[PDB]
Amino acid sequence: GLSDGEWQQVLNVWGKVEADIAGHGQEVLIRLFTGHPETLEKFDKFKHLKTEAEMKASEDLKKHGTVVLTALGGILKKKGHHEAELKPLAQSHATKHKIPIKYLEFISDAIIHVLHSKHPGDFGADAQGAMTKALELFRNDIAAKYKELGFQG
Ligand code: HEM
Numbered sequence: 458g459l460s461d462g463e464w465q466q467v468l469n470v471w472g473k474v475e476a477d478i479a480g481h482g483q484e485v486l487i488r489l490f491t492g493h494p495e496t497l498e499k500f501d502k503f504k505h506l507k508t509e510a511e512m513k514a515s516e517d518l519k520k521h522g523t524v525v526l527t528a529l530g531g532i533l534k535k536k537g538h539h540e541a542e543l544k545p546l547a548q549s550h551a552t553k554h555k556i557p558i559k560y561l562e563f564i565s566d567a568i569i570h571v572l573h574s575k576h577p578g579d580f581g582a583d584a585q586g587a588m589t590k591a592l593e594l595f596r597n598d599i600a601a602k603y604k605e606l607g608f609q610g
Contacts, residue, residue, distance in 0.1 A: 458537050458594065459536070459537065459587065459590050459591060459594065462587075463586070463587040463590060463591075464536045464537075464587070464591075466583055466584050466586075466587035466588070467533055467587045467588055467590075467591045468533065468534065469584070470572065470580065470584050470587070470588050471530060471533055471534075473572070473575075473576055473579075473580075474526060474530070474572075475530065478522075478523050478526050478527065478530075479519045479520075479522060479523045480519075480575075481522070481526060481571060481575065482519065482521070482522020482523050482524075482525055482526040483513075483518060483519040483522040484522075484571045484574070484575065485522060485525070485526070485564065485567050485568055485571050486512075486518055486521065486522050486525070486567075487509065487512050487513065487518075488567040488570055488571055489560075489563055489564050489567045490503070490506070490512060491509055491512075492563065492567070493560070493563050496560055496563065499554060499555065499556060499560070500521075502517065502521075503515070503517075503518060503521075506518070528542075528546065529595070532546075532595060533591055533595075537594060539595075539598070540598075543595070543598050543599065543602075544602060546599070547598070547599040547602035547603065548602060548606070550599070551602070551603050551606050551608040552606065552608070555610065557609065557610040558596065558599065558600050558603055561595075561596050561599060562596065565592040565593070565595075565596055568588075568592060569585065569588065569589065569592075572585075572588070573585075
């Protein structure tokens with residue numbers, strides 16, 4: 458898992474996100490959708506967004522970004538002891554939303570990108586290492602639930 462020092466770095470980085478949850482959330486989703494247009498198709502409510510300008514102007518997209526990062530933040534604050542929080546998310550994303558684990562990889566990468574984009578020179582090598590470990594743990598624990606369900610896509 459992560460060391461206490463690594464968790465401290467993760468939660469310090471997370472304070473940056475908490476100062477503007479909606480802005481970070483919006484940028485993460487836009488990075489996901491523009492880099493991987495197939496992901497947009499999983500969202501009936503965002504399929505109509507045909508340009509990035511439309512994405513940027515969508516208040517509902519910002520709202521969903523807030524929902525997403527709020528859930529992730531709650532998980533991170535558990536420092537790995539997140540079974541109760543993570544299980545339901547894994548199960549909704551596999552069974553209802555049909556989100557392949559690859560797309561969770563994509564959004565994890567998007568989070569790292571957005572952190573550098575919004576905080577250039579202020580997301581240090583140690584911080585990137587710790588946040589990466591935290592996102593891998595999240596993804597990996599979701600993957601275990603996906604395997605239980607026999608879910609691939
Ligand atoms: C950090 C990773 C993610 C987190 C924390 C997250 C969190 C959430 C939450 C809290 C909800 C609403 C409750 C629920 O249905 O379980 C939700 C809904 C949803 N998620 Fe995710 N999600 C993540 C990644 C993804 C990805 C990568 C996709 C697709 C590429 C996706 C697709 C969806 C869809 C289609 C819904 C239903 C949206 C609606 O129509 O309201 N999620 N997500």
